[PDB]
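Hi again,

Forgot to attach this to my earlier email, sorry! This is the prediction with potassium ion bound. I've pasted everything inline since the attachment limit keeps bouncing my files.
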Amino acid sequence: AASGSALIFDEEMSRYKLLWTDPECEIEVPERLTVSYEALRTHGLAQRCKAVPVRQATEQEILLAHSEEYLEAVKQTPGMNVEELMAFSKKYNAVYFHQNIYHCAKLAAGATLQLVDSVMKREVRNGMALVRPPGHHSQRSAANGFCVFNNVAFAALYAKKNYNLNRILIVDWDVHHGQGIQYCFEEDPSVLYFSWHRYEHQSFWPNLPESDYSSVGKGKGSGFNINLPWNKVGMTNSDYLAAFFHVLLPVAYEFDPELVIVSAGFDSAIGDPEGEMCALPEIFAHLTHLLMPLAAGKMCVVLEGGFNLTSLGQSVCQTVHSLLGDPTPRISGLGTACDSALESIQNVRNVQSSYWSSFKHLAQSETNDIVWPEPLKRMPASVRTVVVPPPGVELTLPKNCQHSDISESTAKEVQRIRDKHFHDLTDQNILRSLGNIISVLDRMMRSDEVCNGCVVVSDLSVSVQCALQHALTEPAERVLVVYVGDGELPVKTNDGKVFLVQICTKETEDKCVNRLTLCLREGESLTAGFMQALLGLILPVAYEFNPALVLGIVEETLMRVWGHMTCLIQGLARGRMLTLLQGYDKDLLELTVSALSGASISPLGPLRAPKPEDVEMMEKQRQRLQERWGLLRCTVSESW
Ligand SMILES: CC(=O)NCCCCNCCCN
Ligand SMILES: [K+]
Ligand SMILES: [K+]
Ligand code: NA
Ligand SMILES: [Zn+2]
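Structure tokens for the complex follow:
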């Protein structure tokens, strides 16, 4: 029921800074906050967010994660002169103090708690806090790496205590390891912590052995700590997406969190002097988007690091755009993760194979300065989704959905198309279908007016043929076709314009690398199996293919997962998807339009394990396709 995105920010947090020379700290500046808020204002994003005021964290709230001794020591820093502040600072690693920093740290922490309350009270769907100082390096009794108090740790502990949540996911995509968060939740199975980080075989700050992939948690928490070290610099969009599809997302959808918290550092973006990675600001639009089906969209993004003022602002915008449901940018030039990333990924998956169903097949032999382009403009569609129910059927639609109304120009175009390719066809309504299909496609393709749509149809073949051919000569260079059904469609995949995913009940072999045919055995297995295929096979290929339109097709004869797919597939083609439902089903159509319109997706519940037969079918698919579609790889390839 919740709507809106909270934006929590206050200028007071820009009113502390470094007072002496220190090259290790000089990158952390007040302008990080003002440049980011200014970019949100510039692009119209702040004005579309609910402004929630900041508050101080209380002393009892601070004590959730920190010791009285530490708190008492920090409480004294407002009274110190600069000499005393430098001497206090030097007791810790890579951190400076300022007379106002205790005050701002209490603000950064309270700002996060304000965000958790706004999302958990259903006052907003999700939100972001722009806070200084950052939090994820700080620990029970120490400030560390520009961090005073552990903002994100607070959020999880506050959410456990005040909302009795049993499963919280924390995604830390900052370029540094958040060891403070790891230490806090090491033994706690109710918080799943995932972090990637520049590591370089422990030679990169903070130089900890327990930042390696081997640290999986302790005791009852074993398996709920996931470290993915980057052992070279220059990681790219492909590396990041490979990490999500093959490590993070399989575990997250299996865990089924009730709240997602993001430790969102943008020192992992291109141009950052700390990360020296190569991922574009647009990738954070997808990182955000791919997590939003989780926890019914309850997602608290919390700013950590980020030190290239330009890439920080662009990356913050890409994130808020995604929180607001705006269409994702298309990611070009994706492919295999590099060898170093693949080594990290394969080591992580193997060490976590003891704890997670998505990796369990791995345990047994039988089983197995720089410049870059400014991001393009992301425009919410005037109306998001158009829907064409069968004639006579009116339905309750969200405020951002409309019914279609064939124009005379389109009616002639349908007449031409029947004149040429379909002579002996005169059914007046499976020809209104084609007028619907063509009219809804033109709104999707020819203007930012409409984003996506769904049409109910009767004859699959004529409908699919006209949709696909009208798409290709609009023109849209490539079209991803997703077909749940058992026939053979009028679809040609022998020219590179079309990739066909088919989820069917009859087992088939596909001959060529532009078709992916998944035959899952029906039963209580079906849902975990499908989600495994979606995350580990379908999304990897789709992202690399980079279609300009997605064509979804469902024959009259699964379902539980269809909203997750529809939501996730909108990362492709700027969300331009056309769904063709053969035969009227009230609730499938209602589910489709919900997810197409950007509404929250109901959770699946924690996932059981898929049938080993289904895993085998899927890995055979991977082996068959990963030479062509390298984003499928989650292992280093054999050298000649
Ligand atoms: C919030 C954040 O991203 N902090 C990064 C801390 C950087 C410390 N660098 C140490 C340099 C070693 N010579
Ligand atoms: K991290
Ligand atoms: K934990
Ligand atoms: Na120091
Ligand atoms: Zn960082």
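DSSP finds 18 helices and 16 strands in the chain. Residues 1-367 form one domain.

That should be everything now.

G.
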